[PDB]
Structure formats: C-alpha cells, structure tokens
Amino acid sequence: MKTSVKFETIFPLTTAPLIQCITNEITCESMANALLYIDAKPIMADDPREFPQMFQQTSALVLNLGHLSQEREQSLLAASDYARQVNKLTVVDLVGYGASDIRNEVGEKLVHNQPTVVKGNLSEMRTFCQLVSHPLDQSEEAIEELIQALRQQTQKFPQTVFLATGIQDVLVSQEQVIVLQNGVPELDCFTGTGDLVGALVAALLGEGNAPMTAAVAAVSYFNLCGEKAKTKSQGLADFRQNTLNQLSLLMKEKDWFEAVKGRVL
Amino acid sequence: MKTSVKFETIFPLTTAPLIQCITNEITCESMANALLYIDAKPIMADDPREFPQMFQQTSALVLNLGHLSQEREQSLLAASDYARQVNKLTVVDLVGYGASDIRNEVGEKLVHNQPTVVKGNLSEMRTFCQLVSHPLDQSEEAIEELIQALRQQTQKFPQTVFLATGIQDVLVSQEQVIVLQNGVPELDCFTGTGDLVGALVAALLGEGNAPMTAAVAAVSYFNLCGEKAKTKSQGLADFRQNTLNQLSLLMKEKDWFEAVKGRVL
Amino acid sequence: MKTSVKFETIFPLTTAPLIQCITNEITCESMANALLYIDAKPIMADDPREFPQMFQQTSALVLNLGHLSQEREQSLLAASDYARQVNKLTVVDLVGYGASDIRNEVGEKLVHNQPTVVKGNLSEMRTFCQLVSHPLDQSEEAIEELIQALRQQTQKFPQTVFLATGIQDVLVSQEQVIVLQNGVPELDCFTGTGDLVGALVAALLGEGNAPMTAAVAAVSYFNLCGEKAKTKSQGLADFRQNTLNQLSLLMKEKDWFEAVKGRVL
Ligand SMILES: Nc1ncnc2c1ncn2[C@@H]1O[C@H](COP(=O)(O)OP(=O)(O)O)[C@@H](O)[C@H]1O
Ligand SMILES: Nc1ncnc2c1ncn2[C@@H]1O[C@H](COP(=O)(O)OP(=O)(O)O)[C@@H](O)[C@H]1O
Ligand SMILES: Nc1ncnc2c1ncn2[C@@H]1O[C@H](COP(=O)(O)OP(=O)(O)O)[C@@H](O)[C@H]1O
C-alpha cells in the first residue's frame, strides 16, 4: 500500500495508555484481553459518578452502542457529553445502528458530540448515512455511494473520521478516503471482531497517533492477525483463539505491515 | 438410534437464522460464539423498547432464567408476553429453577405463556414438576417418575416440548418420549453447556425444524461434540475449547449422527 | 518454603463447595470456569431477594468491587451486611479501590463488616492503608511499609486476613506475615487473574481450610499454574488458555507445591 501511514513505528505501544470502555456485556472480556495483548491498559468502568476522577486518568474512551438498556443509555450519553466537555479522544462504535429507533436516537447523540472516530459495519454506516441496506452493498457502486455519503457527513463533522468495516473497509475524513482489503471471512464467525477493532483504534489514539493513522493501523493489524490465524487454524473456536493470540505476536515481526492491501483514493 | 428424526439434513443451517437471546451475563459471549459457529446469527438485545422492531427480524427467541435481577425480570416477562402475542418460536431455559421463590415465580410465568420448548437440568425440571430433588435422581426409577411428571405437564402445555438434561437426557412432548445417552461427564465442568444447548435448540427451531427434532438434534450434536473433544483434550480448559471448536467441525463429517445413542419409549 | 501450611492435603477439593460470586461482568465467565476447573460449584446470583434462600446453600461468598454501578452497589452492601449477620465466610476483593470516592466508600463498608479475607493489588491495598501509590512501591522498603500498615489494619480487623498481590504477594493476619514469590509477569497480561485468585481463596475457605491457608494455597496454586503455563505457551492468548488449563492439571502432580517460594517473616 502506497501510503503516508508510518506503520513501522505503531507497535509496540510504549505509553501503556489507559483506555476506558463503556461497552456491552457480550464481548467485554475479550475487549479487555485484546487491549492487554497489545500493551494498553483497559478500564471497563461506566458509572457516571466516577467520571470526573476517571477522565483525569484515561487517555482515550470507547463508547460502544451494543446491548442497549436504560442504564447503558445513561452512561453512554453522560460519557459522550463529558468527553466533549473535556476533549477526551473518543471512538463511537455504532453497534446495531438501524436495529431500532431507540438505538438510532442514542447513536445520533453520540455522533453529534463530535467524537474522534465513528465506526460501524457497512450496514450500520449506510443506515447512518440514510442509504438503503440490501452482499449487493459491497459492490463497487455501493462502495462509491457510501464514500460520497461519508464525505457529506465529514462536512457536518469535520473533526471526525468515519470507519465502515467489511470485506473491504472504508475510511473517510475531511482530508482522505482510504479503502482497505485485508482479513478473512472467518472474522465474521466469532463475536466481537468489530468491538475489538473499536478498542484497538482507541488504544492507538491513546498512545498518541493521529486519527486516520489510528484507524488504518488498528483495522490493518487486526485483519492481518486474522490472515495469520487462518493459516494456523482448524475450526472456528480455534481460529478465534489464534486471532486473539496473534494480537500479541504479529507485532514482533519487523515487517508485518508489508502485507497491508489498500488504496488511498 | 431407531428414530423418526432425519439427522442427515439438520446441518449445515442454510437460512442464517437470527436468534435473539435474553440471557445471563455469565455465558453470553460463548452463547453468541456457539450460534455463530453453527451459522446462526446471534442478537443479544433485551431492552423491551426494541421488541416491536426486533421481533419482526428474529426467527427464534431464547429466554434464559439465569442471573435474575429486576432488569432481567422486566425483560424476560415482557419478551415472554410479546413472544406469545406474535407466536415467536421460543426456548425457555429454567436456569436455577428451585433456587428461590422469585426465580420460580418468573419461571412459572414464562412456561405459562406456552413456549415451543422448556428446558432445564434434572434437578430444575424435577422441581418444576413438584418432585423431590435428592445422583439418586438419575436412577431408572427416578427417570420413569420424571417422564410421567413431564407427561402430565404436556397435558397442561400441549404445544410445548420439555427437555431435562443429564447423564441421560429426557425429552417429553404430547406425542413422544425420548431418552438420549450421549456426552461425557466433563460437560459439567465448564460453565454454560446447558445455556448453549438452549441456544442450539433455538437455532434449529429458527432454521425451520420441528420442535422435538430441534431438541433431539441440538442435544445430540452438542453432546457428540463433547465426545470428540474428550478424545483430543487434556485438561478442562482444553476440553472446553475443543468442544466449542467441534461445534464448527463435527458437522462436516457426513455421518456424525451415527454416534447417537437413545431410545424412543 | 519453611511453613506451617499443609499443601499436600489442599487438593483435590472433595466437598464441591458452592461459592457465590457477587462479581463484575468482565471476568465472570472465567471466574465460573476457574471454580469448576478446581471442583468448586460456582453460583453468580446477586439479586438480594434471593439471599435468604441462597445463603442457606452457599459455603463461601466473593464480594468483588469491580465495575461498580447503582445495582452492584445495592447487591454488594446487602450481601456484605447479610454475610455478617449469618457469619458467611467472605472474600472481599477491592478491585479499583482508589479509582474514585464512590468505590472507596463502598469498599470501606465491605471491610467494615469484617470479612474473612480482604484482597487487592499493591496499589489498591496501599491506598486502602492511606499510603502513597507511585514499580517503586515493590521495593523492600515499600513492602516493609505495607506490612506494617496491614498489621495496623489487622488490629482494627482482627478476624480478617489481608492479601496484597504483586511481583511478591504480601499476606498479613494478626498471627502471621507471609511473603510469596511465585508466578510470572504475564499474569498481568490477561484480564481477571486477580479476580480469579479471589474466587480460588473463597473456594478453599468453602472447602474448610483456615483463612491464611486458603489465601497462601490459592495464590500459590494459581501462580504456579502460570509458571507451568509459561513453559508451554507462545503468545498471551495462548498463555492465558494454558494457565486456565493448568488449574485442572497441576493438581494432579503429587508434588506441585514443592515449587512454592516464600518466607514467613
Ligand atoms: N469477509 C471479510 N473479509 C475480510 N475481512 C473481514 C470480513 N468480514 C469482516 N472483516 C474484518 O473484520 C473486522 C470486523 O468487521 P465486521 O465483521 O464488519 O464488524 P461487526 O462485528 O461490527 O459487523 C473488520 O476489521 C473487517 O475488516
Ligand atoms: N455426566 C454427563 N454425561 C453425559 N452428558 C452430560 C453429562 N452432564 C451433562 N451432560 C450433557 O451436557 C449438556 C449440558 O447439560 P447439563 O450440564 O445437565 O446442564 P446445566 O448446565 O443446566 O446443569 C446436556 O446436553 C447434557 O446431555
Ligand atoms: N509480575 C508478576 N510476577 C509474578 N506474579 C505476578 C506478577 N503480577 C501478578 N502476579 C500474580 O498474579 C496474580 C494476579 O495478581 P495482580 O495482577 O496483582 O491482580 P490485579 O488483577 O488485581 O491487579 C497474583 O496471584 C500475583 O501474585
């Protein structure tokens, strides 16, 4: 990949950044492990009463829309407002956007507070951009449609980078459009791959990387962990285990990023 | 096993059914993974505000009694009523029935809404049938006692199949009594085997299988995954990993179901 | 280790003790598995409405301060009061103590009810003892400072054993001061090692062991599982898997405890 992104220097993380995750109860054990496996320090606290003291210590924040409830709604909106008040680097992951009105309402509010990164899968982001969601949507036509939609969003949210994940990943900012083409289809066959990509982005933001760099490196690294894992694995449980294991190993190969496939458009 | 159940055709699932799990926070990561490993699509949302929109999309529902709380109680009773109003295929898993009055009260209400399948372990189901719970209860006498008790229940709940899990599994409907004898004792030595069997039943119901077929195939497949896993495993963590891994592999053997042991009584 | 602690007899557990965990949602799947892997029987129920009936059945209780919320606060304080009223053996794990006032307030209340064991990492326990938390704090000076601080606490809480975990582990009671030196640094690189040590202590208390014995054996066994796991492992996911696996295997070596390193001071 012909790119401005300086991959050689991303890993290992050296500041042990504290990454606070206001996240769902389904994938949180694995999100905490992911973050530790790349030398970040996870904290999963979400009680608003702690925010003043916590936010002083954290380097970045994950606001994950998954498994909504009245309690998670209070935390998410409280953390989003507060993150805006104190300029906390923030990744918003629109898990389930489009599933219901209530999710959409909460999701829209998070994005309105102008986070560092907004993230989702193709379906969620298309829905966020008010496009139809019919895959047919991974076509070159549909990708170009979403790129344009996301570029219109970055005009309203000019300090926010948008990430849509899929067979190809689409990253859009006010400055760049990047399409990435790593990973394997088995990365859809265990729970939390999207959630963990969110946490990895936050981790890189917290270490000090620029937003598009954080997004491109997090997605690339995780997807290349999948690629390696597929070669070593038989069965999906085993494939999952190896992907998570690679988070701590792929790093050690001086030239892991040579496998990155993607265009800056 | 001399049986009417057409195992050859159960796997692989081809409709990618969306299975909604209103379940406990202990085993939910593994329930989501289980469902993905057999090509179902898990959704763990439980906020009643979403139900109208979600229920339009889901193919089957898991209502798991585990880790009760006031929030889980509202979700469970709301989902149970609504599932009845719209005839959603539903598996009720009476995790912990007998532990407390409050669990029993919630549990009874779920069963009163007449789900497709009611499930628990021997102890829970015996208690549900108002039998003593003293194992002594896995004896041929005690099994025959429970069969009769469950047959009396299917008279009140004639559209519901009952599953009691154990060394031997007991399945009772208004039409059939089946005893299954697969699995290994190590399937009691990691958390969630019962919970995942519930989710697998829902998955098969959602794909389109008849209830007793769904129950018999889910239990058999999971227990045969255990049998295979034991031959490859040393240590319980390792045994767990391999059981979960087999969910995605055993399927691929054209004749996995030849290992099924059980009588139609 | 020259010690009064009779390790030969700790494992295997033979009473299948029921250990109730009022714990965080991050590491609970693994805490339940841990307990099963050493032949305890986990129950993760935390609704106060069940306590009267549950407490009749449980052998020991884990009160984990992690992932605080208004719901977890009610459960924790309710369970702590009740455990005191009925003399339930209780392990209090001060996860996150020092992070916020609200955590501290809840934590102090748990310790004020005089549990069997209070546990945390060096940082948390130092903060509990009102010491500064700057590692510099693992020095021989800082260890001696904490020992003295903990001895002053056991004067207020003379029926409570205190455990501070780290490179070296510090155990203090009114009768003994013990420093342990097993484990490997990778035990900080997956989530829940501290949480699981808490559950293991409870498990040994529930089986019938004296408090300091329970604490010393739980910490030693878990840390020696890590030591073995490191020799078999490549990558952190893999190291985690093997540590958890060893919980069920190391036991089987007649002389596992010969590897224990530590002084009674
Ligand atoms: N079919 C695929 N081929 C290659 N990479 C994939 C595929 N599906 C998902 N991924 C990758 O795995 C990660 C998870 O993305 P995705 O599954 O789209 O998230 P979600 O869990 O929110 O639906 C992303 O980094 C994505 O690039
Ligand atoms: N001792 C055993 N031998 C064979 N199969 C077992 C044994 N214990 C449990 N199983 C199987 O494992 C699955 C889990 O059942 P069980 O452990 O009874 O559920 P629960 O977790 O609700 O107590 C069931 O399909 C059951 O048939
Ligand atoms: N660097 C280390 N070297 C040896 N053992 C360790 C190390 N770090 C942690 N442990 C051990 O692993 C277990 C987890 O302790 P710790 O990581 O301090 O808990 P927490 O998760 O609460 O911070 C303890 O039994 C401790 O002795």
mmCIF file of N, CA, C and O in Angstrom, chain B residues 189-221:
data_model
loop_
_atom_site.group_PDB
_atom_site.id
_atom_site.type_symbol
_atom_site.label_atom_id
_atom_site.label_comp_id
_atom_site.label_asym_id
_atom_site.label_seq_id
_atom_site.Cartn_x
_atom_site.Cartn_y
_atom_site.Cartn_z
ATOM 1 N N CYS B 189 -18.221 -29.553 33.582
ATOM 2 C CA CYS B 189 -17.047 -28.951 34.209
ATOM 3 C C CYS B 189 -16.552 -27.715 33.515
ATOM 4 O O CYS B 189 -15.419 -27.296 33.738
ATOM 5 N N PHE B 190 -17.390 -27.135 32.660
ATOM 6 C CA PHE B 190 -17.227 -25.731 32.310
ATOM 7 C C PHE B 190 -18.569 -25.074 32.257
ATOM 8 O O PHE B 190 -19.586 -25.740 32.143
ATOM 9 N N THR B 191 -18.570 -23.758 32.390
ATOM 10 C CA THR B 191 -19.810 -23.037 32.530
ATOM 11 C C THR B 191 -20.479 -22.894 31.174
ATOM 12 O O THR B 191 -19.799 -22.707 30.175
ATOM 13 N N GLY B 192 -21.806 -23.047 31.159
ATOM 14 C CA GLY B 192 -22.662 -22.698 30.007
ATOM 15 C C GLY B 192 -23.094 -23.816 29.063
ATOM 16 O O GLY B 192 -23.706 -23.550 28.011
ATOM 17 N N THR B 193 -22.782 -25.068 29.392
ATOM 18 C CA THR B 193 -23.112 -26.152 28.458
ATOM 19 C C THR B 193 -24.638 -26.219 28.296
ATOM 20 O O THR B 193 -25.160 -26.301 27.166
ATOM 21 N N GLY B 194 -25.350 -26.135 29.416
ATOM 22 C CA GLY B 194 -26.811 -26.076 29.391
ATOM 23 C C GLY B 194 -27.350 -24.882 28.618
ATOM 24 O O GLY B 194 -28.233 -25.044 27.766
ATOM 25 N N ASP B 195 -26.809 -23.695 28.919
ATOM 26 C CA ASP B 195 -27.180 -22.439 28.248
ATOM 27 C C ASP B 195 -26.994 -22.573 26.741
ATOM 28 O O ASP B 195 -27.897 -22.198 25.961
ATOM 29 N N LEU B 196 -25.846 -23.114 26.325
ATOM 30 C CA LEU B 196 -25.574 -23.257 24.878
ATOM 31 C C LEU B 196 -26.503 -24.293 24.226
ATOM 32 O O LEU B 196 -26.951 -24.110 23.093
ATOM 33 N N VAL B 197 -26.845 -25.350 24.949
ATOM 34 C CA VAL B 197 -27.814 -26.302 24.395
ATOM 35 C C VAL B 197 -29.159 -25.602 24.122
ATOM 36 O O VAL B 197 -29.789 -25.798 23.057
ATOM 37 N N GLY B 198 -29.564 -24.740 25.047
ATOM 38 C CA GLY B 198 -30.743 -23.904 24.821
ATOM 39 C C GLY B 198 -30.666 -23.086 23.539
ATOM 40 O O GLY B 198 -31.616 -23.043 22.749
ATOM 41 N N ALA B 199 -29.520 -22.452 23.324
ATOM 42 C CA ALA B 199 -29.342 -21.598 22.156
ATOM 43 C C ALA B 199 -29.344 -22.463 20.885
ATOM 44 O O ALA B 199 -29.968 -22.085 19.887
ATOM 45 N N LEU B 200 -28.713 -23.642 20.939
ATOM 46 C CA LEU B 200 -28.690 -24.529 19.774
ATOM 47 C C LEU B 200 -30.089 -24.988 19.394
ATOM 48 O O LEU B 200 -30.441 -24.978 18.224
ATOM 49 N N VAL B 201 -30.907 -25.346 20.379
ATOM 50 C CA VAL B 201 -32.313 -25.682 20.113
ATOM 51 C C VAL B 201 -33.011 -24.521 19.406
ATOM 52 O O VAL B 201 -33.648 -24.703 18.374
ATOM 53 N N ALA B 202 -32.866 -23.317 19.937
ATOM 54 C CA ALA B 202 -33.485 -22.165 19.304
ATOM 55 C C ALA B 202 -33.008 -22.035 17.857
ATOM 56 O O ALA B 202 -33.786 -21.728 16.955
ATOM 57 N N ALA B 203 -31.713 -22.259 17.641
ATOM 58 C CA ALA B 203 -31.125 -22.115 16.316
ATOM 59 C C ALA B 203 -31.819 -23.078 15.351
ATOM 60 O O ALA B 203 -32.195 -22.682 14.238
ATOM 61 N N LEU B 204 -32.003 -24.328 15.777
ATOM 62 C CA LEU B 204 -32.627 -25.312 14.894
ATOM 63 C C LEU B 204 -34.095 -24.976 14.677
ATOM 64 O O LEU B 204 -34.569 -25.090 13.561
ATOM 65 N N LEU B 205 -34.803 -24.543 15.720
ATOM 66 C CA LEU B 205 -36.176 -24.070 15.555
ATOM 67 C C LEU B 205 -36.238 -22.943 14.539
ATOM 68 O O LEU B 205 -37.108 -22.915 13.680
ATOM 69 N N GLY B 206 -35.303 -22.019 14.622
ATOM 70 C CA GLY B 206 -35.301 -20.877 13.709
ATOM 71 C C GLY B 206 -34.994 -21.232 12.257
ATOM 72 O O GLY B 206 -35.467 -20.560 11.326
ATOM 73 N N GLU B 207 -34.184 -22.268 12.065
ATOM 74 C CA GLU B 207 -33.888 -22.766 10.740
ATOM 75 C C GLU B 207 -35.140 -23.390 10.119
ATOM 76 O O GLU B 207 -35.249 -23.465 8.907
ATOM 77 N N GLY B 208 -36.076 -23.844 10.947
ATOM 78 C CA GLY B 208 -37.310 -24.426 10.445
ATOM 79 C C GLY B 208 -37.649 -25.847 10.888
ATOM 80 O O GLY B 208 -38.658 -26.382 10.468
ATOM 81 N N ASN B 209 -36.845 -26.459 11.751
ATOM 82 C CA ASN B 209 -37.096 -27.831 12.211
ATOM 83 C C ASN B 209 -38.246 -27.926 13.214
ATOM 84 O O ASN B 209 -38.501 -26.986 13.975
ATOM 85 N N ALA B 210 -38.929 -29.066 13.233
ATOM 86 C CA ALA B 210 -39.991 -29.309 14.209
ATOM 87 C C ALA B 210 -39.397 -29.286 15.611
ATOM 88 O O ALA B 210 -38.222 -29.574 15.785
ATOM 89 N N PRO B 211 -40.190 -28.920 16.626
ATOM 90 C CA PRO B 211 -39.653 -28.840 17.996
ATOM 91 C C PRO B 211 -38.905 -30.056 18.537
ATOM 92 O O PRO B 211 -37.771 -29.901 18.978
ATOM 93 N N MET B 212 -39.483 -31.250 18.490
ATOM 94 C CA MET B 212 -38.785 -32.424 19.048
ATOM 95 C C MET B 212 -37.516 -32.696 18.242
ATOM 96 O O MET B 212 -36.491 -33.086 18.802
ATOM 97 N N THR B 213 -37.575 -32.465 16.937
ATOM 98 C CA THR B 213 -36.381 -32.597 16.102
ATOM 99 C C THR B 213 -35.285 -31.618 16.517
ATOM 100 O O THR B 213 -34.107 -31.984 16.624
ATOM 101 N N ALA B 214 -35.684 -30.369 16.722
ATOM 102 C CA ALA B 214 -34.770 -29.336 17.164
ATOM 103 C C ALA B 214 -34.096 -29.749 18.484
ATOM 104 O O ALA B 214 -32.860 -29.666 18.626
ATOM 105 N N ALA B 215 -34.910 -30.219 19.432
ATOM 106 C CA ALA B 215 -34.403 -30.584 20.758
ATOM 107 C C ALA B 215 -33.442 -31.784 20.678
ATOM 108 O O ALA B 215 -32.353 -31.762 21.250
ATOM 109 N N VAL B 216 -33.857 -32.825 19.966
ATOM 110 C CA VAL B 216 -33.088 -34.068 19.863
ATOM 111 C C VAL B 216 -31.767 -33.821 19.144
ATOM 112 O O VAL B 216 -30.716 -34.261 19.626
ATOM 113 N N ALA B 217 -31.817 -33.095 18.026
ATOM 114 C CA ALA B 217 -30.602 -32.779 17.248
ATOM 115 C C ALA B 217 -29.634 -31.835 17.984
ATOM 116 O O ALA B 217 -28.426 -32.033 17.954
ATOM 117 N N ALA B 218 -30.165 -30.826 18.661
ATOM 118 C CA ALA B 218 -29.315 -29.879 19.379
ATOM 119 C C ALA B 218 -28.572 -30.586 20.491
ATOM 120 O O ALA B 218 -27.355 -30.463 20.609
ATOM 121 N N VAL B 219 -29.300 -31.338 21.301
ATOM 122 C CA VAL B 219 -28.685 -32.060 22.414
ATOM 123 C C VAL B 219 -27.674 -33.081 21.908
ATOM 124 O O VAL B 219 -26.559 -33.193 22.423
ATOM 125 N N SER B 220 -28.059 -33.820 20.876
ATOM 126 C CA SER B 220 -27.187 -34.868 20.324
ATOM 127 C C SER B 220 -25.918 -34.264 19.745
ATOM 128 O O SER B 220 -24.815 -34.703 20.031
ATOM 129 N N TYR B 221 -26.076 -33.230 18.945
ATOM 130 C CA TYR B 221 -24.919 -32.627 18.311
ATOM 131 C C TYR B 221 -23.951 -32.083 19.361
ATOM 132 O O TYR B 221 -22.759 -32.343 19.318
#
